Amino acid sequence: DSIQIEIFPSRILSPETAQKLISELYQVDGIIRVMVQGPRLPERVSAGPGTGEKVEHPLRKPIQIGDQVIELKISVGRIRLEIENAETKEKVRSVCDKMLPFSFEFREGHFLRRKPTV
Amino acid sequence: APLGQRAITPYTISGTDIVAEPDDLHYVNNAAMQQMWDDIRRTCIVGLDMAHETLEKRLGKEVTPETINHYLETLNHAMPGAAVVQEMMVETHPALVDDCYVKIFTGDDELADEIDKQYVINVNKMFSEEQAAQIKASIGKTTWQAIHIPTIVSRTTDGAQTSRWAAMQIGMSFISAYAMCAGEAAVADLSFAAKHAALVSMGEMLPARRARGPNEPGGLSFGHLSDIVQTSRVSKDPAKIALEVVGAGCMLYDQIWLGYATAAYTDDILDNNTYYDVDYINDKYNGAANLGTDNKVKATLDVVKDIATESTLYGIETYEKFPTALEDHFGGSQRATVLAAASGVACALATGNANAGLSGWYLSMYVHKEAWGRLGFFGFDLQDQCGATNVLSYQGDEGLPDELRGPNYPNYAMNVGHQGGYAGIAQAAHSGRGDAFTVNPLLKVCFADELMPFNFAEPRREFGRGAIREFMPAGERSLVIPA
Amino acid sequence: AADIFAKFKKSMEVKFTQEYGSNKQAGGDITGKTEKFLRLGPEQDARKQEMIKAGKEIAEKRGIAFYNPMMHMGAPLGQRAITPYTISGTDIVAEPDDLHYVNNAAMQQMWDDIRRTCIVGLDMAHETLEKRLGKEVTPETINHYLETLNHAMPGAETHPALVDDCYVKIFTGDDELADEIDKQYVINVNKMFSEEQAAQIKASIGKTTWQAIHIPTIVSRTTDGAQTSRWAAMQIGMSFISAYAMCAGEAAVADLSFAAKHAALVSMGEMLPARRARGPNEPGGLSFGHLSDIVQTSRVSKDPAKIALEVVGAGCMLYDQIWLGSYMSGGVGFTQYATAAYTDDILDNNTYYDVDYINDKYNGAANLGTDNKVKATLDVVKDIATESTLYGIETYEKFPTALEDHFGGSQRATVLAAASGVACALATGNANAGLSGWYLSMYVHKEAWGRLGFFGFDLQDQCGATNVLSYQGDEGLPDELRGPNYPNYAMNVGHQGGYAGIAQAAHSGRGDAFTVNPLLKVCFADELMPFNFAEPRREFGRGAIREFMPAGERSLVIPA
Amino acid sequence: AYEAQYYPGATSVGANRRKHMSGKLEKLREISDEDLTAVLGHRAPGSDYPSTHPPLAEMGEPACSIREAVAATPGAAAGDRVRYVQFADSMYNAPATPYFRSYFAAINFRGVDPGTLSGRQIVEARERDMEQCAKVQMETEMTDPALAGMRGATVHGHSVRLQEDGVMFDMLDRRRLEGGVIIMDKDQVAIPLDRKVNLGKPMSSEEAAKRTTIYRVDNVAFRDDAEVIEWVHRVFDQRTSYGFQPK
Amino acid sequence: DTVDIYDDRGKLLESNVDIMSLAPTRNAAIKKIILDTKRSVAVSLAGIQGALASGKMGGKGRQILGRGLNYDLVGNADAIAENVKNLVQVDEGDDTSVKVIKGGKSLLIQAPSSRIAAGADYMSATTVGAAAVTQTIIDMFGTDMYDAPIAKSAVWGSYPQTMDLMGGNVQGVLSIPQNNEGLGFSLRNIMANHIAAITSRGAMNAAALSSIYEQSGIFEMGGAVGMFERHQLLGLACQGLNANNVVYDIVKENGKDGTIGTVIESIVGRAVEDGVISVDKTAPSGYKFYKANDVPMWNAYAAAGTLAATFVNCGAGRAAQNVSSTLLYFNDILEKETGLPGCDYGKVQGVAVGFSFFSHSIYGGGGPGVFNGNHVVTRHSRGFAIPCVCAAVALDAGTQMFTIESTSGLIGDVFGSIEEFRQPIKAVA
Numbered sequence A: 001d002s003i004q005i006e007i008f009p010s011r012i013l014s015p016e017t018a019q020k021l022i023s024e025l026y027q028v029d030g031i032i033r034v035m036v037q038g039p040r041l042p043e044r045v046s047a048g049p050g051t052g053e054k055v056e057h058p059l060r061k062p063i064q065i066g067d068q069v070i071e072l073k074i075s076v077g078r079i080r081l082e083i084e085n086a087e088t089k090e091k092v093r094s095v096c097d098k099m100l101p102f103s104f105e106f107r108e109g110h111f112l113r114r115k116p117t118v
Numbered sequence B: 001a002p003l004g005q006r007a008i009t010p011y012t013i014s015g016t017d018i019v020a021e022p023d024d025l026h027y028v029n030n031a032a033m034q035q036m037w038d039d040i041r042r043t044c045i046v047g048l049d050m051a052h053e054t055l056e057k058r059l060g061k062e063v064t065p066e067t068i069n070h071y072l073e074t075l076n077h078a079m080p081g082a083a084v085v086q087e088m089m090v091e092t093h094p095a096l097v098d099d100c101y102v103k104i105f106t107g108d109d110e111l112a113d114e115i116d117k118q119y120v121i122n123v124n125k126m127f128s129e130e131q132a133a134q135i136k137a138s139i140g141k142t143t144w145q146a147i148h149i150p151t152i153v154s155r156t157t158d159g160a161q162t163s164r165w166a167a168m169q170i171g172m173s174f175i176s177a178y179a180m181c182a183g184e185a186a187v188a189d190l191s192f193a194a195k196h197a198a199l200v201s202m203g204e205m206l207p208a209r210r211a212r213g214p215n216e217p218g219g220l221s222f223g224h225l226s227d228i229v230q231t232s233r234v235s236k237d238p239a240k241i242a243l244e245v246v247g248a249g250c251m252l253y254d255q256i257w258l259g260y261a262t263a264a265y266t267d268d269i270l271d272n273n274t275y276y277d278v279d280y281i282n283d284k285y286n287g288a289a290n291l292g293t294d295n296k297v298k299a300t301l302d303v304v305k306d307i308a309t310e311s312t313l314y315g316i317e318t319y320e321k322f323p324t325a326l327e328d329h330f331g332g333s334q335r336a337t338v339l340a341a342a343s344g345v346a347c348a349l350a351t352g353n354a355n356a357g358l359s360g361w362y363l364s365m366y367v368h369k370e371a372w373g374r375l376g377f378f379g380f381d382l383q384d385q386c387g388a389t390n391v392l393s394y395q396g397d398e399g400l401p402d403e404l405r406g407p408n409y410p411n412y413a414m415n416v417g418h419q420g421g422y423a424g425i426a427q428a429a430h431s432g433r434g435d436a437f438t439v440n441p442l443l444k445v446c447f448a449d450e451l452m453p454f455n456f457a458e459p460r461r462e463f464g465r466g467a468i469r470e471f472m473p474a475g476e477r478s479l480v481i482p483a
Numbered sequence C: 001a002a003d004i005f006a007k008f009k010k011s012m013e014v015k016f017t018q019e020y021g022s023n024k025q026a027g028g029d030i031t032g033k034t035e036k037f038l039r040l041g042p043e044q045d046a047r048k049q050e051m052i053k054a055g056k057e058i059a060e061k062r063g064i065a066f067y068n069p070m071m072h073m074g075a076p077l078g079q080r081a082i083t084p085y086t087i088s089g090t091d092i093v094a095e096p097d098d099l100h101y102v103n104n105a106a107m108q109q110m111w112d113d114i115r116r117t118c119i120v121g122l123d124m125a126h127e128t129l130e131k132r133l134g135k136e137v138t139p140e141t142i143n144h145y146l147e148t149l150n151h152a153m154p155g156a157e158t159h160p161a162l163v164d165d166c167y168v169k170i171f172t173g174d175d176e177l178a179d180e181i182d183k184q185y186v187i188n189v190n191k192m193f194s195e196e197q198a199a200q201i202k203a204s205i206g207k208t209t210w211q212a213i214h215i216p217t218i219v220s221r222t223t224d225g226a227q228t229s230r231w232a233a234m235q236i237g238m239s240f241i242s243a244y245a246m247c248a249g250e251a252a253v254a255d256l257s258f259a260a261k262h263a264a265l266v267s268m269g270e271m272l273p274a275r276r277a278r279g280p281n282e283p284g285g286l287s288f289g290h291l292s293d294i295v296q297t298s299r300v301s302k303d304p305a306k307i308a309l310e311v312v313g314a315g316c317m318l319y320d321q322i323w324l325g326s327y328m329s330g331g332v333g334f335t336q337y338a339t340a341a342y343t344d345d346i347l348d349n350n351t352y353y354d355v356d357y358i359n360d361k362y363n364g365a366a367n368l369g370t371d372n373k374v375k376a377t378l379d380v381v382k383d384i385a386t387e388s389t390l391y392g393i394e395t396y397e398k399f400p401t402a403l404e405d406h407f408g409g410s411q412r413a414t415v416l417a418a419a420s421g422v423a424c425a426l427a428t429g430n431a432n433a434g435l436s437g438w439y440l441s442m443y444v445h446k447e448a449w450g451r452l453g454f455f456g457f458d459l460q461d462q463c464g465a466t467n468v469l470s471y472q473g474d475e476g477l478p479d480e481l482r483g484p485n486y487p488n489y490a491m492n493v494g495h496q497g498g499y500a501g502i503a504q505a506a507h508s509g510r511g512d513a514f515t516v517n518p519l520l521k522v523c524f525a526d527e528l529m530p531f532n533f534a535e536p537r538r539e540f541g542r543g544a545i546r547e548f549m550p551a552g553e554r555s556l557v558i559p560a
Numbered sequence D: 001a002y003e004a005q006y007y008p009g010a011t012s013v014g015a016n017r018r019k020h021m022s023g024k025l026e027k028l029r030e031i032s033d034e035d036l037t038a039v040l041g042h043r044a045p046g047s048d049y050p051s052t053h054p055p056l057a058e059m060g061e062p063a064c065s066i067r068e069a070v071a072a073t074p075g076a077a078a079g080d081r082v083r084y085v086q087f088a089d090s091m092y093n094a095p096a097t098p099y100f101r102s103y104f105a106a107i108n109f110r111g112v113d114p115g116t117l118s119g120r121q122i123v124e125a126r127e128r129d130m131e132q133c134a135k136v137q138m139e140t141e142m143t144d145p146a147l148a149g150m151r152g153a154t155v156h157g158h159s160v161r162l163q164e165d166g167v168m169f170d171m172l173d174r175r176r177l178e179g180g181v182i183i184m185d186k187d188q189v190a191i192p193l194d195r196k197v198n199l200g201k202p203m204s205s206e207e208a209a210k211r212t213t214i215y216r217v218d219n220v221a222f223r224d225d226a227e228v229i230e231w232v233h234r235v236f237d238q239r240t241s242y243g244f245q246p247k
Numbered sequence E: 001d002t003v004d005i006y007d008d009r010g011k012l013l014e015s016n017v018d019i020m021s022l023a024p025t026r027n028a029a030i031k032k033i034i035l036d037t038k039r040s041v042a043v044s045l046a047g048i049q050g051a052l053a054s055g056k057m058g059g060k061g062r063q064i065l066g067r068g069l070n071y072d073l074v075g076n077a078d079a080i081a082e083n084v085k086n087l088v089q090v091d092e093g094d095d096t097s098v099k100v101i102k103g104g105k106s107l108l109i110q111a112p113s114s115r116i117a118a119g120a121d122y123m124s125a126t127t128v129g130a131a132a133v134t135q136t137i138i139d140m141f142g143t144d145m146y147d148a149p150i151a152k153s154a155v156w157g158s159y160p161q162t163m164d165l166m167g168g169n170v171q172g173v174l175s176i177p178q179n180n181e182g183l184g185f186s187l188r189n190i191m192a193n194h195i196a197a198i199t200s201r202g203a204m205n206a207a208a209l210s211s212i213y214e215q216s217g218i219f220e221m222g223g224a225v226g227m228f229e230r231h232q233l234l235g236l237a238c239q240g241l242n243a244n245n246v247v248y249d250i251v252k253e254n255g256k257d258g259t260i261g262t263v264i265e266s267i268v269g270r271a272v273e274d275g276v277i278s279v280d281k282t283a284p285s286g287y288k289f290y291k292a293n294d295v296p297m298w299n300a301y302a303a304a305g306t307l308a309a310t311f312v313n314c315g316a317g318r319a320a321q322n323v324s325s326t327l328l329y330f331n332d333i334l335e336k337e338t339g340l341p342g343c344d345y346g347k348v349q350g351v352a353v354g355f356s357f358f359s360h361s362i363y364g365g366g367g368p369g370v371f372n373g374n375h376v377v378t379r380h381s382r383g384f385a386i387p388c389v390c391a392a393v394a395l396d397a398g399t400q401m402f403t404i405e406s407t408s409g410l411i412g413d414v415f416g417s418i419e420e421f422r423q424p425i426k427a428v429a
């Protein structure tokens, strides 16, 4: 009965824009679960002769969304949603126009699981 | 309500509703993949007509349909590892070897008609009348056996196991069913017939340098892999057939034989490119992408150039407008693989020629390289740079119809992400023509059986089922293992 | 020996004079020459009843003829009673069916352990790092690198629980180096062997360091045996790159990639010719010395006869039931050509009698040592072999049940020849002496009974005597080196199992630490393997009782 | 005097590729040798170059005509070890691409071993020869600090969408915008320097696309570049016939 | 060691010819036979045309649908021969000969010996012949640029995807070198039906040529160094080449009503008369153990007796089946009745045991005509047991199933046109 969507910003979001964006999406009605995928942000070099060194990435910040602190391991460059109705898909695409300051894509289909695991 | 953080972007099986994590498509964690390889590995075809000539000459027997019924029942008893002649011996447990059986398919319509219909693969029933006519014309009025030895025996052994086991049990079943002596020259002739003279191996034996043997994935040429996949028998979409062959070949070659590919059978990118290619070919070449032997265009350099360049440009535009599969931490060699597969399948569908598909593959690779300045990892570029000049050469070590190519081909010997595309191209060369088989009708009819634990009609769907812990493979030893 | 003769008699009692299942054989005289055949059919076994029921049920379920004992010509199997088998040197009673390698999990696990194991030399990689990379290797660095190797080798995309049997260990001839290294990754030659055995091992491997690599069993089952070397090489390269802080991509690191991947890689087996084409790590290329070394009976026992016999048992099983029984042949199997040499103690009885005879005639020449051994001559071989063969023949002719047990002549010929060859190699300390005694035993058997064996059992035994001492090109190798790919031995059963036990005896009687390869003796000197190579014959019995848990099972990724 | 053309194409990307291959780049910034050595992270800045073998002057050489005729580079005459400078270029109009960065290296510098991947372009050479090549590549328009940068390990980020402020993504942060300029503060292996290296400002998106060598549908697209397509078709056609019959 | 060589009619060819002069590495005719086997190859024009027309190429059951080429190769076989000779030949007027055999259906390509001296082994003949035929097809029949693969694989089968030309239509007397069981075994890898067909079913010609190949391959494999050179040359002279007419004398004297036992009596009588063995000890029961004064000579006598007995048994029965039992039981009863080892010291007897097993059981092998010197079953006798197999096959009368025609029709048709093969004993002598 549900439909599930992804938002693909043309530029990998910084934590601040991702901070506000994800924050009010949780206020959006009709979301079962959300996903944010993108490049990882290591806290230590794990390859090369400079292995085992401290890396404090500018993009690794404790985003404050919905009164919750989340430590980004990634630069959110893909957001897949979960909505039980299509009339909220109009809502989700609408909000991404206002507070994502650049061009983005918006598809629909089976994205997260829709399948048992383990 | 929940917030997920992951950086691996789970794959969704192409043309399906199943999304599987990237580590569920590894053949170690995917039982369907292993079962596919087991079915291909444990399967062999032995003719019944040369043994019948031996029986009728040496012994003076009469080989009637009732004797064949008795002999086939005997053989289906003896093939799973049971004794039929002498006494006081062991026999493989019927629970552990229940995936073993022997069936006969024949180009003789009558001889198939009065044989017990539990041991017969009916060509007319399984195939459309045009494909059935093609198959019967190809094989003649000859009978063949489709032997599938136990999964456990093939797992505990190599792919060289199959012909030996099948020949031993065929000889013993002849001995039991035709009332001939346990040891006599006629028995040897039957053994030599089954083992060599009338045996069709899934793959041939590899050279010394490749430290592996017969009936392995390296001997399984692209024509045999096309014929094993049973989409050309089940559906008429000439592009879906090629895409299914690509999806199965990428797994079987890259993941197992060479030890990435996933993209070819995931996310429906190559499928979209191929369908656009078919539409373009129909629009420009008077619908040559449709089924048929006359509507195909003669394969020339201009045609392949047009088709391959257009396919590559469309793929590049689609990537550059909505990448959605890049950013994988490992580069973009799969981009080149997908583009080349699309171009080659389009060229094959339009021309009905496999080497035209190969030329499209290489032209797409070159257009990729010149448009982006990327081509892949260190490897990868070898095969393309070479092979572009090896498509039409007729020199000895270079040049073969694709159908007769395979992982043991010199250029294709070591690198990943290419051989599945070639199998798909070889399939598409004939699928658009509506042909019953690619290069071997015996393999095409041998795998038109529904008792296989693996569905060779939908290979990619089988991988999807395997990835979600809903595929039951054979060869499990739970009976003998402690609880 | 009287004690072994007693256990032989007890085995015949428990086999014929005692009833098994429902064959109604209770009562009888194991020295008697007559019996009455009840003709109860295969339904007398009970286990065979299980097989019949399962086959019929599968026949209804699937839709084609599967397994009907009525399609045995004449009458079904078992017109004479189904008497059990007893594993030599133990008391576990096994049905014949449970000793078919398809039906024995431990029997499969043995080959899945020899197949998936590899040993990669490690001095050259450290030397390359030190010299041409500046990254000095210190035992802390080796500890970290072996930690990285140990779980990367399982795959790290391989399932965490599906590859639990995938580990790597190291053993070194450098005594001071193995002391610091974390003992979870070290095979210590000084405390897994005795002082003299470990002394010979260290003397033969020198100051070198080696890795024992075991890839997942499911990976070995899915692919062939030639995947082991490549899996190990790739995991070794990954561990070197990820444990020594080296960039992947520069040219100089490729020299190390070669050195650590495959410059000092020792394969269990090798390539085979065309008819039997196969690659490395298949039983056709596994030497007799390599099988002698994979069996850790020498490491954990001082009795030479027991060591030779244990090697014979495992050998027959690997080379007859798996190699010739399945790869080259397939079919029902060759389980009963093989159970002769590791069941019912006829071989043990003959060999212990031969030990007594040699010690009585040659002043304990069959006892452990290296100086008491008699020099190998034709007279010694003729003497020992003939007496051995004559005694074995007298035992078959004196106990009719022992003759009926090895009903086919091939089993009897194999038992006699194995006993004679093992005795000769024990007395003389020469493996080829054991071989020549084997062939003389075959000749005495043939001339005494007027029948030797199956149609082609005499091929390598007619070719046997003359090729033992030849130094021509394709004829002649010390036995320790010979194997199933040897030209005479390539295609016949009932021999290759006993041949390995012959070579083991030539060195077992001397108290030797290893037969042909020390890297194998130490590589398999690890009690962490799911299979126990210290006593293999006890392992087959354990499998036949459904009490052996192997590796490579896919139950976690399969519907239940 | 055969005047090389270096590439076919009348579009802007054609001229840019001809410039990259030909080495006629504009020195768009400047970087000090001590700073360059520090950023390469191969050794301590301001030291003599370690050698893997003694100088060829004293090491002695065989009577090879090629050795007598091919003057060894200064970095090899002193027996310097072999070292590498690695770059990751963005497909979003970054001024260079792996194959054409490699063409520049192989046309402009002796004794070089360029290696091209889809996300890397390693230049491996004797230590001071690679020093020269890295300085040229960093100081000129070929390298845009925002859309490029040295990356010795974990080079992921060439095909990732640029940062929201127009810098190519990096997992290790070998450089980032600081006060409107690119400041590189780690080696190419991502263990920090003792200092801060100023690479100038990142060239704006418009002029970046003006001086790019990637073919994109946004900017000049490959489809309409009939010259490049014609070249590719001619090369592929010649390959196919001459494989069939070399005539 | 001097013998006489007698042809298959029992006539005297050459008198007193020294044994060492007859070795593979010294005899000119044997060297020429080796060179011709190395360089000559046979092409099936009919099969090429059939594969082109029907697309049935690349092995067993393979057929490419929709790419059939309709060329009249058989009709224009003469022009094809001329152009293939033009391509193959290294220099004009050299030893390159191409003949059209049997009305255009097949060709005989004998590449020049320079291509042999300028390469490591014999495969240059096969590869150059296949390349020449493919090139001539593409040339004279105007094959399109995109139809080149089909014309190539109508000659080359599945190579390089397969090690050999599986499904091809060009083949030689010897298989590919990758199929050897050991070092130097290539000359031994000629199946029995090939030798039977080449000599047009002449028993003492098939035996002679098979023994020539076997001894050439055993010299190549280091089997004749020192005293073993004499050991093998005596066997070759006595068995293969009819030394002093012993084999044919025995055949005549035990032909009408002979058996294995009478041939054993003949061999032992000739040995005792010539002095090759004499009574060493006499047991109390009257049995006289014999001792071999001349051990290589006794081995030669055993081999000659083995061949003669195979002749007698398989000619009385007219079945090539009996060869295995003849080879086994002649030597076995010879050991029992004289007290000495059989031919090749149990090696021939064991090869006969294995070859009788594998031709009489479910485990492989086949008829006597599918066994060669390289076979794992019969690679053990040092050149003394395979000649008997080839002679037996040549001496069959329609009893076998896998007959000479079925397995070696092309080989027989093409290579039966060389006199050095139809008359191997005359060539060697």
Ligand code: F43
Pocket: B078, B082, B083, B084, B085, B086, B087, B089, B090, B168, B169, B172, B175, B182, B183, C330, C331, C332, C333, C334, C335, C336, C337, C338, C407, C408, C409, C410, C411, C453, C454, C455, E360, E361, E362, E363
């Ligand atoms: C058809 C053959 C010829 C051939 O090539 N193989 C056979 C049969 C085959 C089949 C029997 C299974 C079945 O019934 O289908 C198998 C198991 C091989 C397979 N396909 O797995 C086998 N023999 Ni055989 N074969 C054996 C043997 C033997 C002994 C049996 C002598 C006796 O008195 O019973 C004799 C030859 C000889 O005289 O030595 C024998 C012959 C024969 N052997 C005669 C059958 C004889 C008959 O009609 O009674 N085997 C043995 O010597 C004992 C072990 C037994 C092997 C089974 C096991 O050990 O696992 C079996 C090994």
Ligand SMILES: C[C@@H](OP(=O)(O)O)[C@H](NC(=O)CCCCCCS)C(=O)O
Pocket: B164, B192, B195, C275, C276, C324, C328, C329, C456, C490, C491, C492, C493, E358, E363, E364, E365, E366, E376, E377
């Ligand atoms: C001889 C050979 O048979 P083919 O030449 O293949 O018919 C060979 N058999 C094996 O060596 C013997 C397997 C059966 C052994 C039975 C007990 S001797 C093989 O399988 O290739």
Ligand SMILES: O=S(=O)(O)CCS
Pocket: B183, C453, C454, C455, C456, E357, E360, E361
């Ligand atoms: O009957 S045979 O001796 O040939 C085979 C028995 S395994």
